[PDB]
Amino acid sequence: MRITFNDVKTSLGITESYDIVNAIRNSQGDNFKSYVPLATANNVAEVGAG
Amino acid sequence: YTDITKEKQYDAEEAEQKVFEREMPNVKTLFHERNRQGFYHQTIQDDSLK
């Protein structure tokens, strides 16, 4: 009597214009440099939208 | 002057071998010295000024 979803995707209807994580990764003097010292950004950026 | 420090990610697995690790506070210093020594000189001939 249990219903479980298989291979569900967190980004179901999400249309990503750009990869913010990738942009933060490759940012040498860019405007994303304010997030470089952040440690758990690689965990916040994935589940911060709900 | 003393500055801010970076954030470290929580890791209990490696928190067992580096409990007594060290991390310097990252301070800075400046020095100032004495650099002006001057004088003003004047003369007065009162007897010949009469």
From Swiss-Prot, chain A:
Disulfide bonds: none annotated. It is found in: Virion. It comes from the Viruses. Homohexamer. Homopentamer. The prolate capsid is composed of pentamers and hexamers of the capsid protein. Assembles to form a prolate capsid shell of about 54 nm in length and 45 nm in width, with a T=3, Q=5 symmetry. Belongs to the phi29likevirus major capsid protein family. This is Major capsid protein. It comes from Bacillus phage phi29 (Bacteriophage phi-29). The lineage of its organism: Viruses, Duplodnaviria, Heunggongvirae, Uroviricota, Caudoviricetes. The gene is 8. The chain holds residues 1 to 50 of 448 of the full protein.
